[PDB]
Design a protein around this ligand. Structure first.
Ligand SMILES: O=P(O)(O)O[C@H]1O[C@H](CO)[C@@H](O)[C@H]1O
Ligand SMILES: O=P(O)(O)O[C@H]1O[C@H](CO)[C@@H](O)[C@H]1O
Ligand SMILES: O=P(O)(O)O[C@H]1O[C@H](CO)[C@@H](O)[C@H]1O
Ligand SMILES: Nc1ccnc(=O)[nH]1
Ligand SMILES: Nc1ccnc(=O)[nH]1
Ligand SMILES: Nc1ccnc(=O)[nH]1
Lengths: 285, 285, 285
């Protein structure tokens, strides 16, 4: 239609997934542009095309990969979205919410998210990591919040509070692992601005974001964070900085997706190892 | 469809209402969360379910009460919306506009509005009242203004000016009545930020709103104000402060709808008496 | 449907236009409110109603003029939109994009745009011109960017960079011509804030825009700029200042479309002469 991300429809998708894999996952992962290699290293993995799963959103107009992958990483049972849904593609609120709510029904209690983002804070360099500690949701302020529509009461409340959407203990664990491996000099914390996209933030938008307290800006993540928070899934979200948009504005330097993907390639293996250790270590609560 | 909030469709609804009640109302009221008790005290009242009124928006997906109530308060003929339409539910621009335009055709020249809101200004405490003197309409800046769509010329102009949307004399009368009853220490004036919702403003969004000159933030009111202003209805809008979001961000205190409704209960009777006196006193122009 | 602004649909419209006119235009023009007289002075002109062109957006609900006009100005072949499409009317992303993509297929490599706007910068007076050097796209930040939807790869990339959307050489040429004619005292440069509309920026929104680095605010232009930039068309965009919204807020002065059109009439002939000279002079690259 697209179908509504309701209890019945999410249950039908979860039923199918449980029949095709015997994996009851505890952790969900959604990976940023060029940051998906960990999904290829899931052990005893089961690849389920979105197109095979009842009620999953149609992704053939955008094309490219679209699989749910289940298996084990670091002794833990996980489910990954291989082929992230971005709202700049035109996916509706219901299409974004359904896969996360299916994760919830499958057993997911922690969602780990990566993205590629532009740096606003002057401290940030290309290749740095930012642990996201809060956000500025321009679509949400502007009546395009991912939860606009009827509330699905079986998943969560009509009015979620987002002040604890980014779990503090998970940020602390991520930082501890970076310190153990001596890459903590790459790791910052910051506020993520959600630019709906798909045009990169303009130079004057970047300057505005700096004035408003934003540390990084990107086109993803906040919708999934909100759906997860609504249904009680804890979240860790990490941005990989492709560029510093404030410096680029001052120096008339352009940004493009090829530059973004080159930064992703430069940090992909380190991010994979970091997230593998996070998965192995995160409290089995 | 939903139907268009045009002259013909609004007239058909008004025709029905005039046949079911002999009340020609001069004043409209729309009440905030937990602030609806005055509607139950309308004298010689006629309760008309929205579902009975031709062209009124369907509200059964959200459920809960949805009635138009007509009768007398303080010697004046009034019409109330019992069960407010909020845009975070997914109601379209046409669905929001039609009931206000029906009010206009029925004779309404003044619309009184209450809401529950978060405090941004550091002066504001839970339980305070804010007379709204202007707004920052994030949905409107972002192409979700309630007037996006064809203009309905019979109601108003293509490009309304909102600099006089909140009538100054009505604010002055509201304040005078608070002074007469010695609760003026609870009363402030301020700029209302419209957060489309339904998630509460995040801590970092609250900090941004402070920087931008916002005094309070909420998820309602601005759409109705704009439809009223477009068709020449004067507006008084009063926010009841549920919490101070800036202090809550500094102290890691959460907000939820149960806390909101508890503040509503604490001030409901005083707000009812205040608005009853406003209705009784507001100039019969 | 509206139809998708894809390669096939834009080609069908271009085919029709090429059959009805033998004009292969190099320059496109889109003119602001009351600023369309140059279109009436196109030489050897061919007027093609939008309603006659396959796949052009339906504009009969809004009504008013809607023609594509082709011919010669200053020795150059041009195509003009007579009757601009504004997103506050409810036109979709596909409806806005199709005419610009048709321009691209017809041969357009430079798009000249005028608009009427409110002044935010304190230096700006009614009747001044602002060469637009960048923008703040509130709809784009808020998930209403004109490119939301599937990417049309034949026209441009999924993620455009807008740092060079407003050609610097074209701004320099426009300014040089103003200096040659001794009206450079009217000409400024500035950042344009896109208010989706159709309500004028409220006084408190104007104050916010000043804090955020905006020089002017209006309800058009940015969507066309983005579609042009996406498909490699260079842009010059010039705002005519109808009023200073910051001064109006301080002095409680209203704005309305009649005042806007009166400023347009006061500068229409000078703007026509300026743009005619720009067309004549702009580099035949
Ligand atoms: O956020 P992720 O998925 O990493 O992708 C980011 O990189 C792409 C732009 O280069 C956009 O998709 C943006 O959201
Ligand atoms: O504005 P009112 O109708 O009072 O309701 C406000 O309170 C609720 C959130 O607690 C939201 O509906 C918000 O808009
Ligand atoms: O931008 P142009 O087309 O000049 O029109 C501007 O003037 C009108 C408001 O007065 C709006 O249409 C605004 O966009
Ligand atoms: N500069 C950016 C890089 C990647 N993603 C963004 O949204 N912005
Ligand atoms: N803090 C808040 C209370 C009530 N409504 C809001 O929107 N925000
Ligand atoms: N003040 C204004 C004049 C014209 N257009 C606008 O958007 N604003």
């Amino acid at each position: 239609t697209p179908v509504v991300a309701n209890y019945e429809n999410a249950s039908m998708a979860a039923d199918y997934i449980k029949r095709v894999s015997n994996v009851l996952p505890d952790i969900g992962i959604i990976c940023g542009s060029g940051l998906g290699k960990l999904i290829e290293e899931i052990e005893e993995r089961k690849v389920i095309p979105y197109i095979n799963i009842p009620n999953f959103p149609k992704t053939t107009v955008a094309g490219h990969v679209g699989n749910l992958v289940l298996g084990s990483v670091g002794g833990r049972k996980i489910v990954a979205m291989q082929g992230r849904l971005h709202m700049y593609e035109g996916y509706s609120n219901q299409e974004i919410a359904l896969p996360i709510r299916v994760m919830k029904l499958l057993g997911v209690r922690v969602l780990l998210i990566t993205n590629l983002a532009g740096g606003i804070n002057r401290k940030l360099k290309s290749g740095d990591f930012v642990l996201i500690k809060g956000h500025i949701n321009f679509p949400g302020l502007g009546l395009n919040n991912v939860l606009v529509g009827p509330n699905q009461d079986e998943f969560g409340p009509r009015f979620p509070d987002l002040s604890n959407a980014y779990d503090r203990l998970l940020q602390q664990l991520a930082l501890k692992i970076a310190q153990e491996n001596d890459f903590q000099d790459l790791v910052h914390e910051g506020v993520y601005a959600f630019n709906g996209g798909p045009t990169y933030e303009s130079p004057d938008e970047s300057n505005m974001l700096l004035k408003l307290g934003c540390d990084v800006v990107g086109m993803s993540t906040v919708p999934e964070v909100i759906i997860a928070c609504h249904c009680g899934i804890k979240v860790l979200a990490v941005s990989l900085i492709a560029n510093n948009s404030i410096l680029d504005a001052e120096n008339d330097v352009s940004i493009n997706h090829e530059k973004v993907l080159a930064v992703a390639e430069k940090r992909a293996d380190l991010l994979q190892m970091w997230f593998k250790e996070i998965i192995t270590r995160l409290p089995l609560d």
